Design a protein around this ligand. Structure first.
Ligand SMILES: NC(=O)c1ccc[n+]([C@@H]2O[C@H](COP(=O)([O-])OP(=O)(O)OC[C@H]3O[C@@H](n4cnc5c(N)ncnc54)[C@H](OP(=O)(O)O)[C@@H]3O)[C@@H](O)[C@H]2O)c1
Length: 308
């Protein structure tokens, strides 16, 4: 069985499958999203991660709906996460945005809803990347109050954030009634987020790693897949570097949402629970040179976005 992790900051101690299926745009992918999700469900996947900005909510929803109709799974068995985009990251636009995501997904409620970025921009139109001139002041307190309201309305079972630094989390905590249940940030062998991870643990905030395999080969040379030391570790275990990566993340106590629409690869991402890394493996991995893969959604980039 796929392990779950309790979302400490939720009153009901919701259980989130430690590994989930991602759905962000894959530059080199022409696979059928809906068909891929159905296959994932048949394989054991129950945790699905999406966002209004991915363009995948529609297909994901069609897949869940069909899967439920065919009796492959029940809504209660699923854990669905979506996110509030930067353009709607304004106090009074939060609920409408969540209602729109729910309509698109053909769902009555989300298991988790996250503020996608600690940024706000011109409302009413999705534009990517975001032109810095279209940015607007982000009212954290006001937006979070609306996320909290979403819980009371039952539109989502839990609320959290994404791409929030320790500094920004500290600010959020100072004005939050309901503490964020999750913080989804980039986390892979080349970007371990040690400090952030410790802070989150100290505050009951569960971490979810996005781009856990640094987007595979969709963006050219993969720093992790090309790491000789990692290749040796994988070779020693008779596993792939991707598997070594996901196992490490699991052992670090975080959750992760690798995206794979390949029947074989998506299954390999689940086969990480009957074996483990060695003390030496951890010592080696702790030595990997760090490099952040995802800079931010704006053009140009914001050098202080992650407060680091
Ligand atoms: N909140 C945010 O700001 C944010 C940002 C980015 C991503 N995400 C989340 O992460 C997911 C999107 O993907 P990603 O950016 O995270 O990248 P990723 O999972 O690190 O990498 C995905 C790429 O790796 C390939 N792959 C998957 N398993 C593999 C394996 N075992 N061996 C080799 N290649 C493998 C995939 O398919 P192919 O090899 O078949 O192409 C794909 O091209 C979504 O859930 C999304 O929500 C969130």
């Amino acid at each position: 069985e796929i392990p779950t992790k309790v979302l400490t900051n939720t009153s009901s101690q919701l259980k989130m499958p430690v590994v989930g299926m991602g759905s962000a745009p894959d530059f080199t992918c022409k696979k059928d999203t809906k068909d891929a999700i159905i296959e994932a469900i048949k394989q054991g996947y129950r945790h699905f991660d999406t966002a209004a900005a991915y363009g995948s909510e529609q297909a994901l929803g069609e897949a869940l709906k069909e899967a439920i109709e065919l009796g492959l799974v029940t809504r209660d068995d699923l854990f669905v996460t979506s996110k509030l985009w930067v353009t709607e990251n304004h106090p009074h636009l939060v609920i409408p945005a969540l209602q729109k995501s729910l309509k698109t997904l053909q769902l009555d409620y989300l298991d988790l809803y996250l503020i996608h970025w600690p940024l706000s921009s011109q409302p009413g139109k999705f534009s990517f990347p975001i032109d810095v001139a279209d940015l607007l002041p982000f009212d954290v307190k006001g937006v979070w109050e609306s996320m909290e309201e979403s819980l009371k309305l039952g539109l989502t079972k839990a609320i959290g954030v994404s791409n929030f630094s320790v500094k920004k989390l500290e600010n959020l905590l100072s004005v939050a009634t309901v503490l964020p249940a999750v913080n989804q940030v980039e986390m892979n062998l080349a970007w371990q987020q040690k400090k952030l991870r410790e802070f989150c643990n100290a505050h009951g905030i569960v971490l979810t790693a996005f781009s856990p395999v640094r987007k595979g080969a969709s963006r050219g040379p993969n720093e992790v897949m090309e790491n000789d030391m990692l290749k040796e570790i994988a070779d020693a275990h008779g596993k792939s570097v991707a598997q070594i990566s996901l196992r490490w993340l699991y052992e670090q106590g975080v959750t992760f949402v690798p995206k794979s629409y390949d029947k074989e690869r998506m299954n390999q991402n689940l086969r990480i629970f009957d074996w483990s890394l060695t003390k030496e493996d951890h010592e080696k991995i702790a030595q990997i040179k760090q490099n952040r893969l995802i800079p931010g959604p704006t053009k140009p980039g914001l050098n202080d976005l992650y407060d680091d």
